[PDB]
Structure 1
Amino acid sequence: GVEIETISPGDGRTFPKKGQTCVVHYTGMLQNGKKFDSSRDRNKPFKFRIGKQEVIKGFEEGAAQMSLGQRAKLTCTPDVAYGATGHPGVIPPNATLIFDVELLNLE
């Protein structure tokens, strides 16, 4: 249930594929709630690859539907990330996630 709302600029053609390690200035956001995560805080913009089930399913599917330089706005359903369990103390069970995602990557 990934719903992309792209802030326009970028190139719109450099698409993420398998075997590609990419860099995201992500920022987590809880719906009707405060923040819980920001890659802009640590200034280490989270190098990660595609397809090895490192990230959640909602962030993984939203990553493939973007391109270089773009600025998306995810809306992750509870069932794809944590909605049965919830991350203990940080993410409550059955929560709906908001992500500010900017892709400035390699490969």
Structure 2
Amino acid sequence: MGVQVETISPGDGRTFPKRGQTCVVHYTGMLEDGKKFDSSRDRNKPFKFMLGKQEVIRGWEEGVAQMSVGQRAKLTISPDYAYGATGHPGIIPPHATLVFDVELLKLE
């Protein structure tokens, strides 16, 4: 599969990230079993990335692009859109489906 976007709370419904814009997000990343492996909220610092520069996994590039500013959404991401067959040593296992709780705070 690719990325499934399920809304948690709505945004403005009008402002969607375009390629080249910087997305400012809070996020929590969990394995499919629910184990949290990464969270910007625990660090109390939002995460910024530039859309279209492949600084994030493909599921984020295609998923966050479907969110409007202010929206909080649950992204479910299959391994091909994520860390693949290889995964990430000691953090992400092979062939992992990942779940992200993502809030799009603003665009820069």
Q: Which residue of 2 aligns with 1:16?
A: 17
* 2:18 corresponds to 1:49: no
Distance 1:14 1:106 in 2: 9
Give the unaligned 5+ runs of structure 2: none
C-alpha contact (below 8 Å) 2:68/2:104 kept by paired residues = yes
Give the unaligned 5+ runs of structure 1: none
1:84 Cα offset (Å): 1.2
Q: Percent identity?
A: 83
Structure ranking higher in strand proportion: 2
1:1-107 pair list within 5 angstroms:
1-107=2-108
Q: TM-score, normalised by structure 1?
A: 0.94
- For the aligned residue pairs, the C-alpha RMSD in angstroms reads 1.1
- Residues 61-87 of structure 1 deviation map (CA, whole Å, 9 limit, x = unaligned): 101000111011000001111121110
Across the two proteins, how many residue pairs are aligned to each other?
Answer: 107
1:47 Cα offset (Å): 1.4
Distance 1:4 1:13 in 2: 17
